[PDB]
Each structure stands twice: as C-alpha cells, then as structure tokens.
Amino acid sequence: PWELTILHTNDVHSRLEQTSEDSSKCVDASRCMGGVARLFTKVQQIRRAEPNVLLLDAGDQYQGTIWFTVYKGAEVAHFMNALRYDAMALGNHEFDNGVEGLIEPLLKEAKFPILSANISASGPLASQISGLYLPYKVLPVGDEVVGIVGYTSKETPFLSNPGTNLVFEDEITALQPEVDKLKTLNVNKIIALGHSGFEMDKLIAQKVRGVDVVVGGHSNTFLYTGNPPSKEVPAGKYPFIVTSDDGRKVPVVQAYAFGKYLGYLKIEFDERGNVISSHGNPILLDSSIPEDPSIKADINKWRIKLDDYSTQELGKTIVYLDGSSQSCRFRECNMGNLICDAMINNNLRHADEMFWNHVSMCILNGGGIRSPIDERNDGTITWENLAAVLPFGGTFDLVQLKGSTLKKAFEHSVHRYGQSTGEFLQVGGIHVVYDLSRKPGDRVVKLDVLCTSCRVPSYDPLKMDEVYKVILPNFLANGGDGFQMIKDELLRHDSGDQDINVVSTYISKMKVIYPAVEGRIKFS
Amino acid sequence: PWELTILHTNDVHSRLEQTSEDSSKCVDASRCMGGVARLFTKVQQIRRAEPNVLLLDAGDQYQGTIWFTVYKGAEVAHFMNALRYDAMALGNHEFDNGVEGLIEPLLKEAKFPILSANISASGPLASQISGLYLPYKVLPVGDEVVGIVGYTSKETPFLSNPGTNLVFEDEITALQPEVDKLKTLNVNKIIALGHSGFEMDKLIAQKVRGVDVVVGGHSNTFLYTGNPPSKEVPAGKYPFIVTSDDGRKVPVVQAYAFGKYLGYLKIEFDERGNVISSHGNPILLDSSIPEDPSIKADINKWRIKLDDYSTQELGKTIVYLDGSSQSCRFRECNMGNLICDAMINNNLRHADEMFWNHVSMCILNGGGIRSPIDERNDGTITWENLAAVLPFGGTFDLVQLKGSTLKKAFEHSVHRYGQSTGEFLQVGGIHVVYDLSRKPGDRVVKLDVLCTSCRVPSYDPLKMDEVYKVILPNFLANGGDGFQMIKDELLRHDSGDQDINVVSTYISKMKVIYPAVEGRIKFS
Numbered sequence A, B: 001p002w003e004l005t006i007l008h009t010n011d012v013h014s015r016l017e018q019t020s021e022d023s024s025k026c027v028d029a030s031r032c033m034g035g036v037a038r039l040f041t042k043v044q045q046i047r048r049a050e051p052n053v054l055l056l057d058a059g060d061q062y063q064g065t066i067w068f069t070v071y072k073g074a075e076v077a078h079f080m081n082a083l084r085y086d087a088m089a090l091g092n093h094e095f096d097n098g099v100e101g102l103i104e105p106l107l108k109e110a111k112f113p114i115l116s117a118n119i120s121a122s123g124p125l126a127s128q129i130s131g132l133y134l135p136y137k138v139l140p141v142g143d144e145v146v147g148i149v150g151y152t153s154k155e156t157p158f159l160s161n162p163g164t165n166l167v168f169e170d171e172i173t174a175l176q177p178e179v180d181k182l183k184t185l186n187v188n189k190i191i192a193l194g195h196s197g198f199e200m201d202k203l204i205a206q207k208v209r210g211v212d213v214v215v216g217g218h219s220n221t222f223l224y225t226g227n228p229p230s231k232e233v234p235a236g237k238y239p240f241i242v243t244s245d246d247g248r249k250v251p252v253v254q255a256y257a258f259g260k261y262l263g264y265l266k267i268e269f270d271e272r273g274n275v276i277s278s279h280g281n282p283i284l285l286d287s288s289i290p291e292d293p294s295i296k297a298d299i300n301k302w303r304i305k306l307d308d309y310s311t312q313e314l315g316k317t318i319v320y321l322d323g324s325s326q327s328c329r330f331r332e333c334n335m336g337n338l339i340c341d342a343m344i345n346n347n348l349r350h351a352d353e354m355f356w357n358h359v360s361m362c363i364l365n366g367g368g369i370r371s372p373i374d375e376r377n378d379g380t381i382t383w384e385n386l387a388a389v390l391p392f393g394g395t396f397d398l399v400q401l402k403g404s405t406l407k408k409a410f411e412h413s414v415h416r417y418g419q420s421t422g423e424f425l426q427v428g429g430i431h432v433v434y435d436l437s438r439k440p441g442d443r444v445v446k447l448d449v450l451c452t453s454c455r456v457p458s459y460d461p462l463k464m465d466e467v468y469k470v471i472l473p474n475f476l477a478n479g480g481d482g483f484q485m486i487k488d489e490l491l492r493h494d495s496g497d498q499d500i501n502v503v504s505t506y507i508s509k510m511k512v513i514y515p516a517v518e519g520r521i522k523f524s
C-alpha cells in the first residue's frame, strides 16, 4: 500500500505570530500556541519521518491581525513559501482587498499552486488572471501523482469583495467534470481542497465521484478522535467519514482555525488509488513544540514595520469617543455608534436591484468596548488607541436571525439593567425603546429596523417571523454574555473581518469623524 | 484739485461668466449681466476717459461656481490679470482651500498686490508666505502716489479654512499703525480696502485716523444715490458718508456682489491729500454694454474643461436619492438629509476645547430640492446631476437665530401642510415632531437640537432664549418662502459656499453614500 501523509491548515487568518489559547495576542509566552515558526518546526519533523507528505492550506490566510493590515498578503506569500506549502485553495477572505489585492501580492508571489475550480472570470480580467489560479494541479509525490482540485464558497460575494467580474459557481457542478477529467488522465488519487464549510465538504465527499479525501475550511470546524487536547469541543470524529453515493468511505477533515492546530491525516491507497484506510488527528501546536529560531527571527524583523504602523495617525476625531463603561453599559454611547457604523460600512457588498445593501443592522455588546479615545491629542487616532478599545482579537461576523430571536436578545440586553454588565447592546440600523418599569423579558416596547429590500433606507417595525442579517461580534454569535438564543437560533453564521481592522479602515476612509448620540436607544 | 477715479468690485464669487438678473446661470443672453468680459469693456472705456484710475477688488473672488471648483483660483489670477486690477484685499473665501490653496494659485500668479494688514503668520508658514501678501502698497497714479491698506474679517476662522497658524487681528488695531506709518513716508492719500462688512467699514472710516476712503465688501452691500437701476434695494447712499473722529467726511463704498455692478467713485483731493468732494454710483453691467470679444473667447476656451468636468463621476450612491417633491415637501426625505449632512460637513472649522464644532444644525426648504438622483447608472453621481437637484445658484450660509425664531420657522414649515408647498423643512442636527391636528402655529410638539458646547454631541430640547448657529440656504436667510421671521430676527448672517459645490465635495469625500430616512422629522 502507498501511504500519504496530508498536513493541513485552514482559516489561519493572519496568525503569523504565536497566540494565546483563545487565539488572541500572546501574553504569557510559556503558554502560547500556534504561529508559523512553531508550525515550521512540526512540519519539518514530520517531513523527516514520513516519505510521502503534502502540506495543504484550505484558504483564509488573509484577514485577522495587523500583519494583514500592513503587509496585505505579502506576509502570506513569504511565510507560506518558507514553510513550502504544496498547494492552497482560495478562501472568501482572499478577496477582501479585491481581485487586485489577490493577484498582487499572493498569486504572483506564491511558489505553490493556488486553486479554485468554481471561480470564473470574464472580460479583460479573464486575460489578466488566466493561469494565476488553477482549477486543480497534479503533484508528484514520491513515484506517484496526486490530483488536488480546489473550490471556494459560492457565497463569497456576500462575505468579501470579489467585484462584479468573477462568478462563483456551484461547487459540485464545477468539481465533477474536473475530477472526471483527471481520471481520464490516469490520475487515480484525488484530494478536494477547498473553502466552503463543513456542510458543503460533506456534500462534496458524498456526491463528487472520484474524490478520495476532502480537506476543508471556512466554518472553523474542529474534528477529533479521542479526548480533545485543548478547549475546542469537537463537532465530530477526525476524519469525519462520509459514505459516497458509489459506496466508498471518504474522509473529510478540517483543522479549526488561527494556526492553533496542524491537521494530520494518513491515507493508505491501493495500486488503483482506492482508499484502504484513513486515520489521524490534528496536532495541537502548544509550547512543548519550539518555535523555529530562523523563522522566529524573520517574524521579529517583519514586526518592526507593524510596531511603526501602530502609532501612526489613521484619522482624526473632533469629538470625545466615549467608550466608558458608565456610558456604554447603560445607554447609547457614541463609541458604540461609531463601531457599528464601521461594521455596516465594512459589509457593503455588491447588491442586486433587490436591495441597497444585503445587510443594514448591527449589535455590539457594550462590555466589548474597553476604552474611550480622547480627542485632545490633536484629534489623532492610532491603531494602538483602537486596540485599547477592542483588545480581544475578535471578528465582526454576519449572522441571520429571526426577529423573534433578535427581540429576545434585546430583552436579554436589559434583563438585569443597572449593574454595569456587559450584555447591554449598542446598535446600528436599529432603533430600540425600553421601558425598565416592565418585567424582565417584557421591557422592549419599540423595535424598528432599517430595511434592506428597499431603494431608500428607512425604518420599519421588526417582524417576528422575518429573518434579518445582522453584523455582530463573534463573541455574541457564539453565545457570549448569555446570548444563548443567538447561538441556538441563528440560521447562518460566517466569520468576518478583524474588529480593530474594521474600525481602522472606516476611520481612515472618513478622515475626520464626529459620531453623535442620536436616539438609537431610548428609555421611556 | 487732483481727481481720482476708484473702480471697485467685491464678492464677485466666481461669476466669470455673465449671469441672469439674480446672478444665477445666464439663460436669456439678451438680458444677462455682469461677467468679466463685460467688465473689461466698461473698465477700458473709463480708462480712456479718466486720467487717474485705480481698479480695486475688496475680496471674495474665490468660491461660487464650477469655475472655482475646477480651476481653484487660477481663473481668478488669470482674469483679474487680464483686467489689470491694481490691488485686491483678501476676503474670507480666499481661505476656502487653506493657505496652500491661496498661495498657489493666487498669490504666486497675481500681477497686482494682494493686501491684508491684520493677518499674521507664525512658524515655518511665516517664512513661506512672507511678502506674498502685504499690509499695504503705495501705488503711483499719474504724478502722485496713493497708499492702499488692506484688511480681512476677524471672523474668517469661522467662515473659511485658514488653518491654525494664521491669526486674524482686530482690524482697527492693525490698520492704525500702518496708516500712521504711511503718513510719515509722505503718503497723504490713503484708501482702506478690505473685507469685513459694511458695519466694520463704517467703524474703520470713523476711527482709523488718516483714512480718506473705505472700499469694502463681505456683506454684499448695495449703496446707491438716486433711483436704483435694477432689483437690488439700497442700504444707503453711495458713497455712504461717515464723519470721522477728527471731523473729516469719509466716503464708504461697496458694490453689491456677483460682478453685477462696477463701483465707481470720483474723489477730489487737495494738495495735502484732503478730500474736497466725493461722488459716484455703481454702474449696472447690463446687456447694453457689449462683452469684450477677446475676453469672451478666452472665457469660452476655459469653459471646455468645465463642461468635461460636469459629467465626470464625483462618487457613487447605492441608494435612490429621493429629491421628489412628493417626499421632500411632506416628510423627511433622504436627499434632504444628504444635503444637510453635507452642509454641516462643509462648516467644520477649527474649534476650541469649548465646542466639538461651532455649528451643528441645518435647515433646508424642501422646495429647494428639485430632482431625485437615480442610483441605477452604476451608482454614478455627476456635477450635472447635482445641478438638477440644486439649480438656483444659491449658497449655504451661516446665521445666528434665537430658539424662539427657529421654533417659529418650524411652525411656518407646516402652517399650511398638505399643499406641496416649498417651505417644509429638511433638517440636520435637529429632531422635530409635529402634531398636525393642532392649530397652525402650535403644531411643533418636540424640537431637540444637537449640542455644540459639548465633547460628545447629543440632543437637548431647544431653548427659546438661546442663540443657535444654523446653516441654511441664502434664499431662507433673506426671508424666502415666507420665512420673514428669519430675516427680521437673525442676529448674524454670513454668506457661505456654493450649494452644488458643498454637496459635490461631500460626495467626493465619502466616495460611496447611502443616506437613510431616520426619524429626524416625525408626525404624531
């Protein structure tokens, strides 16, 4: 039998440096995890031990820390090249800076193939981008070859900034002819590597004939066989076995996010490329694995420009930015309005004639606003200032919530009002009125929301059965601050851009800001 | 006796081309007026006839039409040079593009001295600007000399964008030592030429010893002796005679605005420079005076770039911009919100630690909004589109109004509601609630206004005795649409930037706009 070791990462999201256990800034180095220097050590060890190894990335290296803000993907090409990745699939966040911000730096500087079989281009863009990403690549491994076929979320236009040329086709529709073509070319071992989420990965494994293994991403899915090694709770076994329409057992793998784990799957193939067995588990990249000294020194050199950038003026405020708890946990505060306005601006995506924008609404836990910003330093705002306001390393995510769920969230926002607790919500595109003399659970007396399916945005009463798109912190989408109804009742959840980066980009665009308290939240 | 003819303009405000009678776009050429080509004809005729002539401008050539938007003052230098102006005083609007936008093009390209004795600079700016404007200039006229001493409104920091280096000193304090210095230099004929308004001009004439004549501007003051030749109603005789503290009769002149009139004052001096007599009148530059063919051909050449600019994309909207009368004369409309937000943005000026901005409030007659803009032309907005919304050639001015006056204005806004009349007000920085079941004059049931003397902008109830700064159309400041209370009760009025230009600059800054209807105006 011919044995292949697949090493894989996904949704690394700019975690070039080692992180804390929750993937935020590393504080106590002796307990930090991940980072490319530590990944290098582990990949190198495995490559000494196993003859046939592929190192694959399932997309979403772009977006997540100041590394991406400053280097804009050059850091991804550089450090993925240093790790000698064998292939990468395009994720949604690879389009965050447009097709131009993908072509340069990433596609032109990567030394490995970058893959997606379900993205097509038209017009001059088609000639400009031709061959810079590929539907698949056939790679030599030892004396054999392995075909790797890529895919990218069909929902990317709602989750990034790909522009209006590119078309994202249905994954299974695009993948099947490519896999059948590879069979006709005597390629009998085929990995589907792509960025659509665990649920789509399972459908691909079931329905795309000829796929031997699916290596996925997007949903930050943690899979494990046995007692998990850290705090992440598995969604299923590793690999997750799908029975294909033609009776084969097809392993599906993912490796959480943020570079905390290295996926590791061993597959045994027979001479005809049939899978005999598959087993493995993600490896927790904890501090027992040393950071490679040379990669670490390179990381530290690249960090200089990040430190320099962090104190540069992004823009100016002419108003005090009130991010105090005494305001933001008790009433509408202008820092909350600013952040929610930045959240909505970040989520402006190309729209049909059916909506002015696909999302208009924002909620933000006031306890997640951690500092004011004083305007008396010549109005200057720096990244360092914003990192004091938003220190948790979160993202501003997109969810779909029924109106009934959102109303329950606003009741939860004030269910124990008066104690300076974090669940009090700041808002955008929502006007709420509370009557605190009513019983907890019945304190929301008016709740109006900004329309999306309208050419002139205006407010209408919230409807209990209607499903609304809302931008909110990952922390809330995951049920933080007691918002269990959000986690349990949401209909869709996609991870968005880094919290600081969302606000920094908006301030830079606006140049001079003056957010007011304007009646988004009132008390009767 | 030595006779001097003073020809003078002020507040031309970018009216390079001939205009209609009300100084807007020329439509029926046979009845149009003003423009530099016609001015050239008349100045040339007078210079053939009178031996001792000075042609003076009292400031505010900058700002008013697409000419300034595109050429940014190069048109002022070019055409004032062609007319051979002898001197110009700096007005407030010469600072609209900052000191940088004054130095280049105007100060470096004018072939005549540009004057202001009450503006001082510090730091590197002082070395950069030294000598490019002057406190005064002594000019030879025939066999005599005449000193011209300049001044500029002390209020310029609130009425333009001069920056924080320059200091505008009290006019009389700065002028007196310069005039006394000229006396010691054997200059016995002295004109004060400046840009502070008719009231300050009268104080200068009264109190600055040695000033023989004051040539002013800023307040668009029309003075005339006899039956006026057009629709402007005189504020007093021409010249307006002030008796100085030392007993002399000092003529004060101004010549309205917009290039419609050429001021013309004849002064007889004795051998010691005492004024024996003064008489004259502004000359209406009507169609009986031919436009100079060569200046006109030059104007038409320069117009090509304006026509080209007028169809270029300024920015994008992703929402329909509802400037329909059915919306904007009946309720809050998003085009009204956009325009008022642009008005407030245009009036962001440097502020003490005593206010976040000196003005926060805006009113706009809905009848002054003349078209929607459809978003389905790839979202594009052009100057031509904005000129359809705002076709009247107005300005967005700064006034001071007591709260009682503003409340009366909002009652007037709905006093005959339901007839699609123009007085219905769109707003910014004001939240109003009407109850139309109440009697006219008693329909405003809530009126809250955005604070200025606050570090965090928020709304408070309007106070009847407090004086508020408000940005509103010139048309309303002058009592249009029946707002006689505004004209009669306002405490301060200064002319602002061109209406289209205010909106165009804001759209260009924002890049992508999406104004909502958000509850600034409600009905109970």
Ligand SMILES: Nc1ncnc2c1ncn2[C@@H]1O[C@H](COP(=O)(O)CP(=O)(O)O)[C@@H](O)[C@H]1O
Binding pocket: A365, A366, A367, A368, A392, A394, A420, A421, A422, A423, A473, A475, A481
């Ligand atoms: N990861 C996180 N992301 C966003 N908000 C968070 C996160 N962790 C905690 N918070 C916020 O921080 C609040 C707790 O704040 P404090 O009362 O100041 C106590 P402390 O900061 O010591 O936890 C929570 O209620 C929540 O709103």
Ligand SMILES: Nc1ncnc2c1ncn2[C@@H]1O[C@H](COP(=O)(O)CP(=O)(O)O)[C@@H](O)[C@H]1O
Binding pocket: B365, B366, B367, B368, B392, B394, B420, B421, B422, B423, B473, B475, B481
């Ligand atoms: N110079 C102006 N500046 C601003 N608004 C003006 C001016 N002249 C007229 N308007 C507006 O135009 C309105 C009249 O509009 P319509 O009912 O459409 C009749 P018409 O346009 O024929 O005068 C006035 O009530 C006022 O709001």
Ligand SMILES: [Ca+2]
Binding pocket: A188, A189, A190, A210, A211, A212, A272, A273, A274, A275
């Ligand atoms: Ca196979």
Ligand SMILES: [Ca+2]
Binding pocket: B188, B189, B190, B210, B211, B212, B272, B273, B274, B275
């Ligand atoms: Ca004299």
Ligand code: NA
Binding pocket: A196, A197, A198, A199, A200, A219
């Ligand atoms: Na999924």
Ligand code: NA
Binding pocket: B196, B197, B198, B199, B200, B219
């Ligand atoms: Na005046």
Ligand SMILES: [Zn+2]
Binding pocket: A011, A013, A060, A093, A218, A219, A495
């Ligand atoms: Zn991701």
Ligand SMILES: [Zn+2]
Binding pocket: A060, A091, A092, A093, A195, A217, A218, A219
């Ligand atoms: Zn993703």
Ligand SMILES: [Zn+2]
Binding pocket: B011, B013, B060, B093, B218, B219, B495
């Ligand atoms: Zn003026």
Ligand SMILES: [Zn+2]
Binding pocket: B060, B091, B092, B093, B195, B217, B218, B219
């Ligand atoms: Zn002026």
